Every structure is written in structure tokens, then in C-alpha cells.
Structure 1
């Protein structure tokens, strides 16, 4: 089982906190977005473009179940993995860290970024708020620990998690 599984919205810091947390614990980071691109040979945007979200979600659930069984380090899930009921069921029993972020800050963290299909293009603040309203209940449901990241720098987030683990 991973030492920690990180969930939350795009820009909440999964990739960032995951890397820093894994370094701290001296384990590997498995980022499921990365794992998907290495598996398929394709970019996430290109899977979404040609195959669509539903196919991305099926591939993502396969990857996630396997990593939950086989990975003993830190595991960072894609931001929308919790929208899959099978991912949510696979997460039961696991140490799941919900990185919380306000929409205003989340928007600003993701602002330069053009590699997220569900956020790209215009009207980003609206789209982000809509994602947060849909998913917040789902993150809260799978989480065993919640960490507010709005006013915390990444090293402080890591230390907060470290102190609450194990």
C-alpha cells in the first residue's frame, strides 16, 4: 500500500507535494498522469482529443488499481480520478491526503498551464469553480486526512503531512 495517496483539484499540488514528500520519506513517487503517458506513449491532451475522457478514465482506473497494490511509496492521482466509482472503491482503506485549495488560488496556480483539457482555453475561473463544486464531495469522501494548502508553502504542507503519518 502507498505511504500516502494524494488527491485534489488540478493545481492543489499533487505532483509537487508528491515529489517533495517522496524525497522526504526516501521512497519513489508514482504520478498516475505520468504513468498513463508512459503506458500509452501519448500525451493526456491527445488521449482526451482522440479517445475522449471516458477512455482516459478507464485507462486511468487500471493504472490506479495496479499502483495502489504494487507501489509502496507516494502515489499522486490525476485530479479527476475520484470521479470514477471504481477508483473510489479501490481507495477504501488507503491513506488518502486531500490537498485543499481555494478556487481563486487554484486558478492562479494553473494559469500558465496549457496541458489540462478540462481547464484549457478561456473562462478558466468559471470552469475551475464548476470542477470544485462537482468534485469537493468526492475528495472529502475518499480522504483520510485533509490539508489546507491556501496559505502554506509546499515545504510546510510536506511537514504537516509527515507529522501526521505513521
Structure 2
């Protein structure tokens, strides 16, 4: 089972923390969005446009379940996987690290806000606020560790996680005797 499954909004650090944590632990890194593309030979966008969100979620759930079973390293989940009840079921029992971020920081860390075409319509910051409102409660539900990334740089985030993922060595005593 993965050492850690990372979940969070866009810009929360799934890629950055994924790499740095996997480096610190000396383990493999798998991202479920990349894994879907690798297993199908189709872009995420194409699967959505062509098959619809529900079939994307189906493919996604199979990939997530396989990775939870087979991957021993760090796993990062695509943002919407937790919307599938079967994915929430599959995660139960795993180490699930929720990288927390505010709307303002999430927008900044994903390229900033956009020009607003119509005063009466929404801008990028407002769309992000909507995604947060819907996703954040689900990340909270599935989490076993919550880490605020708003005021910690990536090195600090990784050190915080490592301090809470420790594994005692069962052969520790004997090692000192040989």
C-alpha cells in the first residue's frame, strides 16, 4: 500500500510535494492522472469530451484501486477522484494526506486570476471558489493527516509529513548486535 496518498485542490502541491516526499523516502511516485493517460493512450481532456465525466470517473476509479493495491510509494490523486463514492471506499485504511490551501493562494499558485469578460459573469477566482466549496469537504472526509500549505514552503510541508509517517524498524535491536 502507498506510504502516502496525496489529495488537494489545484495548486495545493500534489506534484511538488509528491516529488519531494518520494525523494525523501526513496520511493516511487505515481500520479493517477498520468496513470490514466498511460493505461489508455488518451488525454484526460479527450476522455472527458468524448466519453463524459461518468465514464472518466469509472476509468479513474479502476486506476486508483489498482494503484492502492500495487504501489508501495507515494501516490497523488487527480482532483476529482474523491467525488466517486467507490474511491472514498477504496481509500479507507490508507494514509491520506490532505494538502490544504486557501482560495487566494490556490489561484496565485495556479497562474493568478483572469480577465473578466462580463461584469455580471464569473472570473477564474470565482470558479476556483466554487470548486473549493465542493471538493474541500470531501478531502476532509477522507483525510488521515491534514497539512496547511498556505504558510509552509515545500521543504517544511515535507518535513511535517515525514514526522507523522514514521515506521519503526522491527530488526532495529538485532542490527545493533551484529
1:120 CA drift (Å): 19
Please say if residues 114 and 123 of structure 2, whose CA atoms lie closer than 8 Å, have aligned partners that are also in contact. Answer: no
Q: SS at the partner of 1:115?
A: coil
Normalising by structure 2, we get a TM-score of 0.85
User: Who wins on radius of gyration, i.e. which is larger?
Assistant: 2
1:56 CA drift (Å): 1.2
Q: Deviations over 1:84-142 (max 9, x none)?
A: 00000001010000000000110111127999999999722111111111111111110
Structure 1: unaligned runs, 5 residues or longer = none
Normalising by structure 1, we get a TM-score of 0.91
Please say if residues 6 and 76 of structure 2, whose CA atoms lie closer than 8 Å, have aligned partners that are also in contact. Answer: yes
- What's the Cα RMSD here? 3.9
1:106 and 1:66, CA in 2 relative to 1: closer, same or farther beyond 3 A? same
Q: Deviations over 1:42-76 (max 9, x none)?
A: 21122122222211111110000010010000000
Please say if residues 115 and 123 of structure 2, whose CA atoms lie closer than 8 Å, have aligned partners that are also in contact. Answer: no
Distance in 2, Cα, partners of 1:74 & 1:118? 42
Please say if residues 99 and 147 of structure 1, whose CA atoms lie closer than 8 Å, have aligned partners that are also in contact. Answer: yes
Distance in 2, Cα, partners of 1:72 & 1:132? 29
Distance in 2, Cα, partners of 1:56 & 1:16? 25
Q: SS at the partner of 2:98?
A: strand
Distance in 1, Cα, partners of 2:114 & 2:126? 16
Structure 2: unaligned runs, 5 residues or longer = 167-178
The list of structure 1 runs, each at least 4 consecutive aligned residues, that deviate by more than 6 angstroms after superposition, is: 112-122
